Amino acid sequence: MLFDLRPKTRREDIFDREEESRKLEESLENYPLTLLLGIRRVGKSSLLRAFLNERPGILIDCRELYAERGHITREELIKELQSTISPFQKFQSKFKISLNLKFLTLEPRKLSLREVFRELNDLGEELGEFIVAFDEAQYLRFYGSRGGKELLALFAYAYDSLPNLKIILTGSEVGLLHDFLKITDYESPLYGRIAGEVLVKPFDKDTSVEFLKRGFREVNLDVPENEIEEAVELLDGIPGWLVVFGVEYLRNGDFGRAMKRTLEVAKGLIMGELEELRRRSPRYVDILRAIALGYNRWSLIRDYLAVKGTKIPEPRLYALLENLKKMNWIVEEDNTYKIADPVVATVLRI
Ligand SMILES: Nc1ncnc2c1ncn2[C@@H]1O[C@H](COP(=O)(O)OP(=O)(O)O)[C@@H](O)[C@H]1O
Numbered sequence: 001m002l003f004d005l006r007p008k009t010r011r012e013d014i015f016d017r018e019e020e021s022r023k024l025e026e027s028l029e030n031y032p033l034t035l036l037l038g039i040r041r042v043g044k045s046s047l048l049r050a051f052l053n054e055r056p057g058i059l060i061d062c063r064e065l066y067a068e069r070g071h072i073t074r075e076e077l078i079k080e081l082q083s084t085i086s087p088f089q090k091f092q093s094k095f096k097i098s099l100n101l102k103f104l105t106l107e108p109r110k111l112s113l114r115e116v117f118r119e120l121n122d123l124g125e126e127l128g129e130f131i132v133a134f135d136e137a138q139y140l141r142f143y144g145s146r147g148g149k150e151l152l153a154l155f156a157y158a159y160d161s162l163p164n165l166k167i168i169l170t171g172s173e174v175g176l177l178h179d180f181l182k183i184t185d186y187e188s189p190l191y192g193r194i195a196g197e198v199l200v201k202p203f204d205k206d207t208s209v210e211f212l213k214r215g216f217r218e219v220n221l222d223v224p225e226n227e228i229e230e231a232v233e234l235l236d237g238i239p240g241w242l243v244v245f246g247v248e249y250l251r252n253g254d255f256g257r258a259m260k261r262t263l264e265v266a267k268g269l270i271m272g273e274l275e276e277l278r279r280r281s282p283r284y285v286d287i288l289r290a291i292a293l294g295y296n297r298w299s300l301i302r303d304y305l306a307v308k309g310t311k312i313p314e315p316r317l318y319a320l321l322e323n324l325k326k327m328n329w330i331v332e333e334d335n336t337y338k339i340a341d342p343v344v345a346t347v348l349r350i
């Protein structure tokens with residue numbers, strides 16, 4: 001069912017995304033390397049898991065690799081490749097593969113990334129294609145001690161020399177992903193190499209309404225039209241929040257209490273991420289709150305914060321806002337800043 005908090009892993013469990021799935025297939029057909037891009041909670045992991053459900057591939061969670069030590073080593077990455085494709089006999093049974101993988105017998109300490117990728121390409125040769133997906137690949141900048149350059153080199157090698165191997169990199173922090181890859185810097189191993197781009201956006205109004213409608217239909221619940229309209233006006237096409245709301249409504253039976261609880265859950269998660277930002281600079285959260293309150297132009301932001309205590313120099317303010325954009329907290333459009341996720345804005349206004 002739609003209104004369920006467990007991870008979605010199959011195509012029949014994903015509402016719409018039929019254009020996005022086709023565009024992902026098309027990108028794989030056209031380029032060795034594909035970027036899957038969009039706001040956090042928009043549905044990238046879910047789409048990717050459903051896509052790999054039918055197509056031989058592995059998904060590596062780069063954020064989960066970074067989380068523990070704030071750093072990723074070769075051994076850890078390799079151990080994760082090993083465990084994600086295991087038990088390999090299950091894989092061979094599902095996709096009917098006769099080939100065995102040597103690197104699975106070997107200790108991560110004594111394997112190279114290139115060795116592993118060559119074996120996966122050999123597997124691709126039998127199948128047609130093998131997919132390696134890095135979820136939130138911008139965290140690979142915390143790999144090694146050279147800013148993850150060994151991964152860029154590995155990707156350049158796959159691009160040029162492993163034709164039965166396709167790589168998907170996803171990122172919620174889109175600008176930060178583009179920064180890591182550096183495809184226009186001559187120093188980058190990926191220089192001049194073109195990647196496909198598949199963009200995952202929030203549902204439109206009518207799709208959001210239909211999403212909620214389907215969710216309630218599945219449990220024979222009829223929810224008045226105006227309550228679904230009101231939920232979409234507050235929750236604006238973000239499937240992550242639409243599912244939390246659907247769950248809370250099934251549990252609570254009331255628009256007010258379901259939305260109150262949805263906002264509680266959102267507040268908790270967003271506050272956790274705002275903690276992370278606040279450590280880097282308290283300024284980030286100050287700027288975010290200002291924008292959420294309607295101080296959404298340069299001078300509006302600058303005067304507001306000066307008045308609340310902190311005068312931010314113009315070069316600093318520019319850098320801070322640019323970073324916020326690259327992290328995708330914020331969009332700048334028509335000479336105006338906005339919080340990328342309207343629920344984040346709701347939480348920042350308290
Ligand atoms: N197309 C969809 N259909 C149904 N539920 C979805 C869809 N996309 C996302 N979800 C729900 O929203 C949550 C957030 O999606 P996720 O794929 O984790 O976002 P992202 O990877 O973009 O941060 C998922 O756990 C699932 O609850």
Ligand SMILES: [Mg+2]
Nearest residue numbers: 044045046135
């Ligand atoms: Mg994700």
